[PDB]
Amino acid sequence: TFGYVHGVSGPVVTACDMAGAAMYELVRVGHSELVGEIIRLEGDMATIQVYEETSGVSVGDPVLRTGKPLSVELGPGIMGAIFDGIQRPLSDISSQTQSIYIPRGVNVSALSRDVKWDFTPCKNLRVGSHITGGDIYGIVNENSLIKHKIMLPPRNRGTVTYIAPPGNYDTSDVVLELEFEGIKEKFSMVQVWPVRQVRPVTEKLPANHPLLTGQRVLDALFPCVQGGTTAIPTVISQSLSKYSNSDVIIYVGCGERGNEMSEVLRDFPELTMEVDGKVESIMKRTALVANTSNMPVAAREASIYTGITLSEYFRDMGYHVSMMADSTSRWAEALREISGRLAEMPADSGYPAYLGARLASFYERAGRVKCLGNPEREGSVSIVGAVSPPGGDFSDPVTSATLGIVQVFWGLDKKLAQRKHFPSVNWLISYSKYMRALDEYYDKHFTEFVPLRTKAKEILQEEEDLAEIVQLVGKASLAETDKITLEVAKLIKDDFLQQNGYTPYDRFCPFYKTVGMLSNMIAFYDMARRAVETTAQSDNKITWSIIREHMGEILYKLSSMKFKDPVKDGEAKIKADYAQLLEDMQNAFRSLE
Amino acid sequence: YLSQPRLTYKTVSGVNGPLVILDHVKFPRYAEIVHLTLPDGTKRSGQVLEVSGSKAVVQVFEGTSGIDAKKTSCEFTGDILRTPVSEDMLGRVFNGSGKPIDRGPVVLAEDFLDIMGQPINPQCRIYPEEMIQTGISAIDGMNSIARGQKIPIFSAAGLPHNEIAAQICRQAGLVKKENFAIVFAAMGVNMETARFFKSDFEENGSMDNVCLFLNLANDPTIERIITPRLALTTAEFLAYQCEKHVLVILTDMSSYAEALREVSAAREEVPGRRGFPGYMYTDLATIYERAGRVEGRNGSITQIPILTMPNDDITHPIPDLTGYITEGQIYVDRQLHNRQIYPPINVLPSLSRLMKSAIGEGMTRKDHADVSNQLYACYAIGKDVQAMKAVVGEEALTSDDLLYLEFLQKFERNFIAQGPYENRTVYETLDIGWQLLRIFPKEMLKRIPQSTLSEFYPR
């Protein structure tokens, strides 16, 4: 309960009179109450690392012992709140202090202790019902979209002897008093869970449903699933926040720059979404974790664990969370400097030896689960990491030890950026290992797409092993089946994998229109191949350069598929246009032969 | 045996990372297992790291997050880490520590074997003789694996080496013209490839051959180091005491060495070359050299390690030392995976250094030597014509360089291309291999001698 500072030495504090102190448990160092973490016991002393600036901490300062490690507050009031990497609400320290600064040792509640929430019990409990860890006993109308479900803590069970009457409550009163055998206890409306502990589940279901990202590339050739893990080495993350099939977004910037973090907090309360014809601010179904590089280095490493623990909490209600964890490589640079303070031996380029263990302890909390509780729920957490290598390599220990863990790699390069292509998709080092899990969704609902996806990845590959000779030799003595797979292959690279994100046709790409565009482009490839191979020996052998001059008006309708608006036009107004065009592609070849 | 009761200390002198250091210990053994129980009740396990007089440094497996030096009880065992082996564990799925995860019961032991293992007497080895038939044509036709060979599969991240390993395990057997088993160790896997391995082998009907050790990525990095030693002590019971032929597949041995580098640096050791431990050559050798046939027993162990080369580097010390102890390589290639070929196995760099003893008459068939090096020459001469055709065009190639480009369109799509469920037996990877060698006349096949050209070409 009481320690004393025996000696500080930089951000590491040695405390005495700490006999029963646990590892990684929280302490309040100093007279200003700096939050710390016990990292090394030696007998009755306790080496503490301080989560704040240590200047002015004398010896003989009191060290309060709490009994609980670094943990977040879970409850109603989270959605819309701007937190820190140790969950300090930055939109309320700016009010209760009325300054531009974060003073040392602030103790602001992470959830507000003044807002009255409308409690609604689950109408199937009573005074004398049996309830165990995970059973929903309340519903809070947090805002219009989120039905905030109150849940029992895991490893807590018994019989209810007090349920709270439906009304309006704050997050401090005693809403639930169930009893275990002999001992009565009390539950509030907020719960507290340690950020390095996995929130428990019943079973981990396979991730078999596609995460609809709003784009044409990355959703046909390299698909992601609900419950999957990606890597992006803001137009891919802002697109998922408006249109995708996720009900809670969690944006976690670990060590991002100050002006690029003040950019996002300016932009998200202006964004809108389309729910039922009404427009709604997207800051009703997201919560950010703001963290810059001026912040404590101990609160930058913990921002990833706070972000996924917040992400796992809204999973258990039954929502499908999608967490974007921006700048994973900044998070590893927080692991490099903690390990240097401990005098830990580095393994690879100064990074600790456990860089892969900590990343697999974060990326493997994603996935579709069967949620712990009574009403048979099902939620999921998608994690979208973002490695920033030192100039686009797989040599650093952060980029290469992410690709040994994740399943999707949305591999981007810097050379393929000045084409004004936008995205900077590479499609040679980018993969997706959710092609075998999605062989049931594609074959049942879409039943045609896997052989077109097999061909369309091949046409863009045969172009590569031609293009080195097309540069050096230059199209002089070439076969005519290769001129198909350079002009049809060019038609893909400007009309299928080409985007521009502020336009009224290319901010959402629905998937039935996405397979509708490839249903014509592969058919034009195979009919150009079947023409050139059966008319290779008989009489009046043709090349490509007699077709593209003759069928110049066919190559305009096959190039004006990306410019049809998916938003103004009808749902069936776009497939018939792609089904009428096929008979302008089946009859058109029968005008040459 | 060990009939004395066990001491349960609560004299913890400190915690420093994953190390718990006790004091006033009565005669502590080295590498002895302890069982820590936390204040709240969570039982964790750990292994003794260093003894010094009355001290003991214990490396807790599941971390030290919640251990205090006042109320933690650390019960010593007195015996080192051993496994229970049985023949009825063929058909189970264990994790890295050896506990079942297939809703199964605990394995009733026939023996308790020390998992570190003793080396084999080098006089008591026999040279590998017969063939292990995998079912993949690219490693049975031209890169054949003996009985007792150690041949690693070299690949990279993103490449489908994990489905090659699952297709070997479904179809591995003998070379038929009751004693075959497979011990599949999976180190450093994620969840979505752990339920690929757990689901593929159990509903493709051949779970009864395979004993699956699945060590996850989120599981402790010490439990990844005892995973290939649990799998090889099971294989050394099943083969050298039950006379089975065992195939030992170790998946992603570059993930063993990333957990060995992590366990070494958390033991407060100083790293060696490229950050890896200095004893990395004699640490893989304790795994790889648990193989081969033995004198006086009818079993064998053939190993197939699998590697992931970072940045396609070969001078990295995980492929450097694997190619230094093991005999050949397989070389899953990236330029074939982008062209949609399964399995994407490159032939030109791959090699089996004991392939000339696993083939022949009375082992596979008489022409398996002369077919394989003939398809190897025509695969190389075609791939020069494949690049040369782009330089000069099609109108400048003769009726010689068209036989090699028409063979090359059918060697990659019929010999290399297999599909994941098509078990080509080795008698059918030669008839595939002959009906590509009929695109050429008998005046062109230089690598085949004329006596077997008369017996196998005209059909």
Binding site: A343, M345, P346 | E268, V270, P271
Partner: peptide
């Protein structure tokens, strides 16, 4: 190599004092 070794003996000097 030497600098990570030299900080280890300084931890041993700190522990034989106690």
């Amino acid at each position: 190599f030497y600098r990570l070794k030299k900080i280890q003996e300084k931890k041993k000097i700190l522990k034989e004092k106690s």
